[PDB]
Structure formats: structure tokens, C-alpha cells
């Protein structure tokens, strides 16, 4: 990992970075997720896995560097938003300018948030029994995850 | 809405079918166990008549019928309202002595000695 330091004279110094744990359980796996047999076994709660693909300020790393396949990139990206919105990444906050401060409001606890809270309209007319307007929970990208319930998960609440 | 004639292919079994249901295409069974498991209400009148002809007026009570084509022809009419199970005789046909000691099991077996005791 190379970091640029300024003095004007500016220079970038390369530092050694920790390497991947040797001996993946499932060698010959193209993408990193599949090498460790994690194709359908991670959710937004798995911060330890997700944090590895996150920039120090909460941004997602580019697909090329991580090497993830498109299908898993989309899944990893979506869970991180849900992880961020659920307050599971307190140390990856945005780099607010020195002239700015947090919004200072109390924070409502959330989890499994598909959309950005700012831009969701209220459901004033909810509808009757076989007319109900549904409140989305979770992300459709994760429908293929392993399910340990009698029937498939209730996405629409 | 009229009576329908089922294509003959429906009643021609396949080799795997014999494996699944465990019936030999040779030495076919002799007697049916037939029980009505659905209602004749809301069904066409011809279905109502065949049910009375076969004796299946009460539901979930088994009736014994001949595995012969003429009987089979009526059974095909009400195939959807009944359950057909092959009668089995593990200990042979009942005799005069064993006529009063029989019991028909849910498995399809007519046992001729019914003791109501642990197998031991």
C-alpha cells in the first residue's frame, strides 16, 4: 500500500501489507468468495467479511482490485449499504470537512434497509386485505442465500 | 360438459411404475379395496350413480370388488373420488374357523388371526 506524503516536495512510499491467509479451503475458486465456499452464506451482519472490501471512510473498493465476480460484487456492495445504514461500521464514517459536523439528530435504529432513508415516501393509503401496499425488507439480491426456515423469507412486510 | 373417454395410454404402466408401487405385471391381484374419499355433491349425476352401484355411499369405509374389466370400467368413471388398494392375504384366504377372527389392516392385508397382543 503506497501513501503520498507532502512537504513543496511530495513522495509516495510503499509499505508492506498483510497477505491472504494461506491454503484456501476450496482452491480453484475463481472469485475470492467462492474460494472459501461463501457463495450463499454471508449477510449484512457479517461485518468481518464485508469490512475487508471497504475503504477507510466506508466506500466500496473497485471490483478489479478485490477480484470479485459481478454477481458477488453487487451482493457485497448492497450488504455494505445495509451494514452502514444499520450502524454496524462506526469507524468507517464519511470524511466530513473540518467545517462540518454530524447532523446532530438522534439516530433511529434500523436493520435490513433496502433503500436510502432520505428518499422513501410514506404509505398514506395502505390498502385492504388483498390490496395491501407492502413495505420492502431486505434486498432481493440475497434471495438465493441459504434459508433455514420452513418457507422462503418474507421480503414484503 | 359431458362424459369423457380417457386415452388408453393412461392405464398402461411403465417399468418404473412397477418398481414404485411394487406390483408385478404378472400374477395380478384379484380383489380391490375401494374407499370413497371425496363427496359426490357438486359432481355430475353419472358419477353419483356409479358410486351407489359400487356401494361407496359412506366415505372412508372400504368395499371389496372384483378386479375384472366390467368392474374396472365403472371404477375408471369415479377414479378421482376413491382410493384403490390391492387386497393382500398374508396368511391365506379365511376358512370357516377363521371367518370370525379376521381384521383388515390399513396396509391392505386381511389377517385371519387377530389377537390384540404384543408381537413378542
Amino acid at each position: 500500500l503506497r501513501e503520498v506524503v507532502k512537504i513543496t516536495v511530495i513522495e509516495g512510499r510503499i509499505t508492506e501489507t498483510p497477505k491472504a491467509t494461506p491454503d484456501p479451503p476450496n482452491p480453484s475458486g475463481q472469485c475470492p468468495i467462492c474460494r472459501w465456499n461463501l457463495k450463499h452464506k454471508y449477510t449484512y451482519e457479517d461485518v468481518l467479511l464485508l469490512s475487508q472490501f471497504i475503504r477507510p471512510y466506508g466506500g466500496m473498493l473497485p471490483r478489479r482490485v478485490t477480484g470479485l465476480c459481478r454477481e458477488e460484487h453487487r451482493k457485497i456492495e448492497e450488504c455494505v449499504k445495509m451494514a452502514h445504514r444499520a450502524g454496524l461500521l462506526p469507524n468507517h464514517r464519511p470524511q466530513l470537512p473540518e467545517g462540518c459536523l454530524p447532523k446532530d439528530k438522534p439516530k433511529l435504529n434500523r436493520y435490513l434497509t433496502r433503500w436510502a432513508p432520505k428518499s422513501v415516501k410514506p404509505i398514506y393509503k395502505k390498502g385492504h386485505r388483498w390490496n395491501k401496499v407492502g413495505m420492502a425488507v431486505g434486498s432481493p439480491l440475497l434471495k438465493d442465500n441459504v434459508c433455514y426456515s420452513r418457507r422462503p423469507l418474507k421480503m414484503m412486510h | 360438459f359431458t362424459k369423457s373417454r380417457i386415452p388408453d395410454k393412461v392405464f398402461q404402466p411403465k417399468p418404473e411404475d412397477h418398481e414404485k408401487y411394487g406390483g408385478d405385471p404378472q400374477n395380478p391381484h384379484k380383489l380391490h379395496i375401494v374407499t370413497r374419499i371425496r363427496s359426490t355433491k357438486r359432481r355430475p349425476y353419472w358419477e353419483k350413480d356409479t358410486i351407489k352401484m359400487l356401494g361407496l355411499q359412506k366415505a372412508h369405509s372400504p368395499q371389496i370388488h372384483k378386479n375384472i374389466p366390467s368392474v374396472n370400467a365403472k371404477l375408471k368413471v369415479v377414479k378421482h373420488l376413491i382410493r384403490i388398494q390391492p387386497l393382500k392375504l398374508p396368511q391365506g384366504l379365511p376358512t370357516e374357523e377363521t371367518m370370525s377372527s379376521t381384521c383388515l389392516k390399513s396396509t391392505g392385508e386381511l389377517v385371519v388371526q387377530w389377537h390384540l397382543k404384543p408381537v413378542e
Binding site: 388483498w130 418457507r151 | 393412461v10 392405464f11 398402461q12 404402466p13 411404475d17 408401487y21 406390483g23 405385471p25 395380478p28 391381484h29 380391490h32 374419499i37 378386479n67 374396472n72 371404477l75 375408471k76 377414479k79 378421482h80 376413491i82 382410493r83 384403490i84 388398494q85 390391492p86
Partner: peptide, 27 residues
Amino acid sequence: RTVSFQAKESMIRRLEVEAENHYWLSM
């Protein structure tokens, strides 16, 4: 209007019983 899970399972059961009726009527 979708069809419940109870409704689709129960019919398949009845179909399987009727499927066996086809076999026992062929001998």
C-alpha cells in the same frame, strides 16, 4: 390473486393418490 401454499400442496397429494389409482386399474 395468488394461490396459497396449503392449496397447491393438498392438490398434489390428491394427484399422487389418483396417480396410483391409474396403476392399480391397469392389471
